[model samples]
Target: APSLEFLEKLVIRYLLEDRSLLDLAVGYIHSGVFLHKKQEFDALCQEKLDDPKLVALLLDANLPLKKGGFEKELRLLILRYFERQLKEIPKSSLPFSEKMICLKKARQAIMKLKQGELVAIL
Candidate 1:
């Protein structure tokens, strides 16, 4: 399975090549979609791809997708992240009622994203 770290960097690298997508990139990065590299990504957002270490990470950002390439991989990663959130909700210490609400919204968010509604994502 492709790691979220790999997919996140791949998306960032793909976005870097096209400045027009930077808003989409910046928006998602700040939306807490990336867990493992959240701090590093914060730095990336601050520099907008200028940091040397961040640039180096982008050099090897290639994914062997059957089709749709990085774009497909990005959506896949986001879905996986939401799925993780679903699992975490049950494991959280919140009351059952609040947990149900969280799960409901999370599933709706996932459904919307799967239906190509990127704006519906948190």
Candidate 2:
């Protein structure tokens, strides 16, 4: 889970100049809960997803995008973003090498997304 401050900064950075992209990014961010907590997050996301403006945003292409082109680019971008976020975790709380390993796992998972692999609620 991202800190509220981190989430807020990300939203502002991604959406500041582009409301449409902001809307889509928000949906993606909202979708980032653990699988066991997804039902609750989904309910929250669905409510936000219902906004007509946000729906339009999700479909818009003019907004800034973290990923695009082939699925590979998308996967890579996601992995990079996660790695960047992991850098912000306190070293006192998590050993740097341990965090690196965690990031590596996340990178592997993101790479798998290029092969149409994902963990989803069935």
RMSD to native for every prediction? 3.1, 9.7
The lDDT of each candidate is: 0.67, 0.45
| Candidate 1 lDDT by residue in tens digits, 78-107 | 678778879898999999999999889889
Pairs that clash in candidate 2 = none
C-alpha TM-scores of all predictions: 0.75, 0.34
Give the residue spans of candidate 2 off by over 4 A. Answer: 1-30, 33-49, 56-70, 90-92, 95-100, 103-122
Candidate 1: where are CA atoms >4 Å away? 27-31, 48-52, 61-71, 119-121
TM-score of candidate 2 on Cα atoms, chains taken together: 0.34
Q: Could you give candidate 2's per-residue lDDT for residues 1-122 as a string of tens digits?
A: 54443333333334433446635544334445332333433443465555554444445565443643223322343444555545654343678787677656656665665566532211
